[PDB]
Amino acid sequence: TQYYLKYFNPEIVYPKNARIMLDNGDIVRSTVVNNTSNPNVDMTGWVKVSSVSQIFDETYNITQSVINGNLITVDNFGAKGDGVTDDSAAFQAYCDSALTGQNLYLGAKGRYILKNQVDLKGKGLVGNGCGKVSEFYYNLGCIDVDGSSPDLQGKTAFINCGPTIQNLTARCSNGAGKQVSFIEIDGYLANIDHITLINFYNQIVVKQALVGFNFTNAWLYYSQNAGIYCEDPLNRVSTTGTFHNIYFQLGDGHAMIFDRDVHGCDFDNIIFESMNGGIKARTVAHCGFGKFWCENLKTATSKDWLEVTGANSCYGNSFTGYVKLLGGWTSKTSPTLDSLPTNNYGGVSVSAEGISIVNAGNKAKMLMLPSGFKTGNATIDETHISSSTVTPLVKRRVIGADSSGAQYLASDTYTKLSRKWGTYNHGSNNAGAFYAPMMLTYDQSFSTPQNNNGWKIVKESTGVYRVERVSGNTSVITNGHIVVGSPLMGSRLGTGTGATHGIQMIETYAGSWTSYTEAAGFKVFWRDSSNALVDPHRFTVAFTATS
Amino acid sequence: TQYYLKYFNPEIVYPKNARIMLDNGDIVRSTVVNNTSNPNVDMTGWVKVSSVSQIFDETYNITQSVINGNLITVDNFGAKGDGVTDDSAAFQAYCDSALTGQNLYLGAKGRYILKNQVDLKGKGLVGNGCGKVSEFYYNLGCIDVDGSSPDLQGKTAFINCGPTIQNLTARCSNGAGKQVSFIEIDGYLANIDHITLINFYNQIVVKQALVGFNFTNAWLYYSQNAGIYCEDPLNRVSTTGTFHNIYFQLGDGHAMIFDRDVHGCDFDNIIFESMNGGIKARTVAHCGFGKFWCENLKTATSKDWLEVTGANSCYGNSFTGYVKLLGGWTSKTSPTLDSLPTNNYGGVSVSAEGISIVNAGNKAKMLMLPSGFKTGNATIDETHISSSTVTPLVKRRVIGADSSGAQYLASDTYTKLSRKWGTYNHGSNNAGAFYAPMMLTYDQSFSTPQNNNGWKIVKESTGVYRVERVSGNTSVITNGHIVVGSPLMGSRLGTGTGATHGIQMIETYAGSWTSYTEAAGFKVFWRDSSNALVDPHRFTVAFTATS
Amino acid sequence: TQYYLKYFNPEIVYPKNARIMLDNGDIVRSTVVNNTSNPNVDMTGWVKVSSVSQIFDETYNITQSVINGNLITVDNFGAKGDGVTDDSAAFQAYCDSALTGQNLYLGAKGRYILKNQVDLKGKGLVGNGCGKVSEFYYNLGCIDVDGSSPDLQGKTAFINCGPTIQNLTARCSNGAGKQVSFIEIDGYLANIDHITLINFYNQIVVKQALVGFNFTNAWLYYSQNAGIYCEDPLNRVSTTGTFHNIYFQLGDGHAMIFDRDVHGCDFDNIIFESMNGGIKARTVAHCGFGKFWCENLKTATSKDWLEVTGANSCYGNSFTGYVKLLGGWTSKTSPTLDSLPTNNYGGVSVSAEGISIVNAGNKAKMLMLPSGFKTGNATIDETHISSSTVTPLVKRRVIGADSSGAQYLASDTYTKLSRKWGTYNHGSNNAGAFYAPMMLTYDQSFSTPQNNNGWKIVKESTGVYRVERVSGNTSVITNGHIVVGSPLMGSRLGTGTGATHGIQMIETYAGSWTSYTEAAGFKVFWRDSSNALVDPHRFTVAFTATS
């Protein structure tokens, strides 16, 4: 009478809305008229008044039950996040539930211990913060995998991850030597961002091959084998993966290991600090590499920041950010690196160190520096972009000023028949040129006549020599310059006696020279001091095929 | 007596804190003394005890009502997310509510059907996960627009979106041919990231023009017209938009369509897989393009990855990532592409294919490859960076080693008056040089005298010729080398007779040559075998203006 | 009898599950048998039935108390977010609470006023949306710092921020001239993304130095001093910071100020609109700079987009995006900028403007444009990539077509002893060449003999001259070409008389020339018209050391 408490009584008929207590003390309300059912064994016709399905938010005129569908976490399934209790069953219940969405979520605060593998069943993973690598952040929010658990030895803690890993701090405690990896995620369609992973054997285990795989803003500390590992067991070939803003620190192994081939992937703003390896792959093809900061090795003495193991399997790449190398890191991608005859890390390299380009399987490499150019094969080509164009080139070079004081660029000539360098006199307004003539020498001791460009010198008769076209030479001299050189008389060594020359042109057709200054060649006539025709043993001529 | 149930009684005075039931069975509590008001018609002086305003979390000493303000979603407004029920009214109620924040949020799990257009009223859109393109993820969390709804035909499903679209999966079901687009968002200030969009006509409809518009990490599948469409009807000109990590797959149209002009935008790590078009725009100016992976076309046979329609309207760009082309995709931006006289896709292009630079409206293009250089206009210039500097250049080239075994780079000379290539003898420690002299020919059959660089040859008298400066030529010979060539006697063809020459310098001032080896020119004297002066018809001289 | 209300009565023994009212009207339930304790003064053995610890979600069989641990915000601690009430104490309570996780969170809707500094105690900051810069978004969700509050003058509103700032809109109201800054965050390990900051003195205050610091997608408007400020008081040197997708608008000062040194940082897709300064630092070393859009200055007339104050302290950089300059912005990094002898902004610069490379402390700079090349020091070098290789180079140049119509690239020669340019006659199938010979002049008026490449000319006897090797010249002539020039007789000016020459080779060993065409040099013999030996005053020779 002085308090409220009534248990079920089988003699009573409970009207609609009547309230009594279950034997455990919880109040139930009848939802039907003439209720004679015992709510302790049969809840038909009754509801528990302390249930959120019976509590309403008047602002929305909906039950608290509905509002509790806004955000569901592992806490809903009994996870404690208390740094001690194994929450693996709660995590699994979440992933097996009909009520949960695309991703698994952690509660606001908790250090969630996992002593058994969790099958995410295709759900992604969203944590409760991306923290620094310190106990302060682990205590506020993280997944803490128990690496000492026998059931996790040699296994990955999370399998069948969906396309999301984000906003997460996750560590492995007491797993040294137990080969506990963190998470398995498929290579096709992933967004991984804002994560901090601490310890583990492999931190990110990629299944199958990359394609549309995006990875950014990750602090990956103390991995024992790799920060990111992609086996690609079926050799699908990884493509179109992006890896940005990743800090790899104090790992016993590599930053990234691809057992096989990587194509069209992008790597930028990556840090290797005290690792024992950088990025390792069998093949790296048509990938982009931006800025890398490589500082110190954990126990190794020397390591390449990028390690490609296949012969001529590093090609088509863009090494277009500066790679900082400190404390033992080396590079096979620097613009200033000398080329090899084969097995170069093929690609374009652009940084303050230089602008260069090289292919994997050839010695050719060009490098531009502030001073000019360097070549890897002792050769520099100059030609047309079009492979079909067969005109000569003209090079223009600043040599002075015109009368107004503007730069004067002079033009050269390099054809099959002419080598010249232009000039100009702005005082008198006359073009000019410097000449590299054809030179050609007759020597009666030669086994075969010397030939320059289809011309040879032959003796016609005593004292008369033809500088003549050989069979097939249809080229001509047009208004050319002619210089005859010095005679060696009497023998190849020469007696020291002299001779006087004159010339006569050889026409291509009657009147070709007289009228049009076209010639096939020319004759040289040699005479002694008595004006008699004489035969030198050897003499030179120099001539041009144009004016 | 054996249960608890009391309805309102008008004869009773209810004290403060008294509890009774409303006619519907819900308990009310009196908040005032002497309460005689019927709570069924007048709740003044009463509160409903099952309301969250009357439920407390003792940890915080606040009502559940306050806690329910932490996260509000469309579920608060009656959205079912059940794959059947039209939730459009609930979505609209959310956007019209005084209680909701910057963005619209989905509940934890739900496939939210929309059969009518939703006006976001400036709210952004945050989903419940960025999933793969599969029913598994649609069933867990997405917006599912009913493309068969007559009220959505030819319209956009969401209008007036705020500056956020994120963490979202959205599809259009049964909308083939109905031209249903997904969302309209203003071009000024946007962050779009971690989205998956499936079907629709235009997936992202940008209103007005881009500026400060950031778009990343998007899987855009099966669009019928475009993944991203920007009309820019007022021709404001789009600027400063970023488009990164986008996978366009199996669209019937283009990846991106700009009807007008795009300036200063960045595109990187984009995939076109089985599309019918890449990025199309009227003008593309000063944009950055990084890595593209273009593989296969849906029904088209050949498409450019970047399609710019305006004449000379592609200029100032950076094509600085590798563009992979497979299955019909083409490019107008490759470093190795030959230049056109006009309508080039103007910009710098850098990849393993080459390093090149070209302007839109000119044939000039330079390309650096491992082998050396290629030009698009048969010309290569060498000059100063400064347009006012008018000194000559010096080229240095490795030609051997010095006595210590270090590389010896020799210097050339190319001035208005001298062309030489330096050398050095490290055995005797003497500099040397190779010479390209001026050559100049006299021919009495010429209509006008030949002139080289302000010098011509004229007959002074029988057998005496001046190699002399013409009016305005104030340049000089300093300690030069002189070679006289071969005479053609008697006629232009030549008789074949010879002659003997000597020279005499022409001074610039009295003693200039004798004392300072400066000359204006020189005379050539020709004599026959009897030492009498004679006149050749034609002869050559070669000389240098410096030693 | 006609309502439910019973207060505590000390004469009564309350059984387990008995319910009565506290004096305030709240119902309590006995949890123990034989309960005689007054719940108004002693809650042992009682529980409040309206507490969320006594409310259950039957879907999960957990209390609402547990569900309320899923998301905790400042609203849990009494924050009103009403645009008037100071919520600083509530924010501080959140950060001091044992219940909260890594980050501080805002409620769904609220304009949260702060009139006092909040110490985040190492917690990061997560807002309720990243809005546009307008009252519409401030009213829906932001932090609104009261800049008129005396307690905030000259201070930062938030101190000791954790590694996260995201999804946030924050403004300072009425703070003009009060030097109120927004937030202090440590430089080591940060993820800042999707923020909008309005007003403040310094918006982001970085403590210590950058390392693993990632900053993206930020709209930073109206700062009075800087958008981002890093003092680095201990000169630790900032490294490995990324700054992407940042819109700086209408700031009275700079976008970013580093008082000291920055290494290995990346800046990309940044906008300066009506600022009074861009990025300022003492040292910028090995940093990457991508696309910048710089449009207009607030009150300044001219500002560099990048301002590095230290002498030769801008070096090693990559300026590899286009920098748009409008309305007064200038640049010291353009590829077309002329080099200085010192204090260049050192690095590689790549854009549609050109491809260039320069060092800080030297005049050297190379630039490639569509036309060819430009140099900053009037010099262009061509050498090997290897510093130890001492072979000559060969340049190949397109000069025509072969008989099949394919491009023919001809090879040059430039050794210590030979300068030639190759050619080929495809009509007759003969190689050819153009020659730049050594030239060397004898002059009896010279104070010392002229020397070219270890050869000089000396008089042996009347009319006999040796073109001979000097001591140490062990180089040889092999099958060379020889041309003797024109004699100046009788005096340096010349009388005009002539002479006739012949030559004789000088062997290196007996038979060297006769048998193997090897010579040390050659003799020149000069004779008058009566065939008597005579001595010219001066004469030239031209010769080659190879055929």
Residue numbers in the entry:
A (entry chain A), B (entry chain B), C (entry chain C): 19 to 565
Sentences from the paper on this structure:
The trimeric ΦAB6 TSP∆N is a compact, elongated molecule with an overall length of ~166 Å and the diameters between 26 and 63 Å. The three subunits are tightly packed together to form a parallel, left-handed, superhelical twist. Each subunit exhibits a parallel β-helix in the main body and can be divided into the N-terminal particle-binding domain (PDB), the linker region (L), the receptor-binding domain (RBD), two triangular β-prisms (TP1 and TP2) connected by a highly interdigitated segment (I), and the C-terminal domain (CTD). The central RBD region (Thr225-Ser483) folds into a right-handed, parallel β-helix composed of 8 complete rungs, with an extended α,β-mixed turn on top, where a 10-residue α-helix caps the hydrophobic core of β-helix domain. In contrast to the β-helix of other TSPs, which typically contains 13 rungs, the β-helix in ΦAB6 TSP has only 8 rungs, and 4 of them contains the fourth β-strand never before seen in other TSPs. In the linker region, three α-helices from three different subunits form a helix bundle stabilized by 6 sidechain H-bonds between the three pairs of Gln216 and Asn220, rather than hydrophobic contacts observed in other TSP structures. The exposed surface along the interface forms an elongated solvent-accessible groove of ~40 Å in length and ~10 Å in width, where the hydrolyzed products of Ab-54149 EPS were bound. Notably, ~44% of intersubunit interactions are concentrated in this region, despite the involvement of only ~19% residues, suggesting a critical role in maintaining the trimer structure. A close comparison of these TSP structures revealed ΦAB6 TSP to be more elongated in both the monomer and trimer, likely due to the extensive structure of triangular β-prisms as well as the fewer coils and smaller loop insertions in the β-helix domain. The structure exhibits an organization similar to the structures of other Podoviridae TSPs, despite the lack of homology in amino acid sequence.
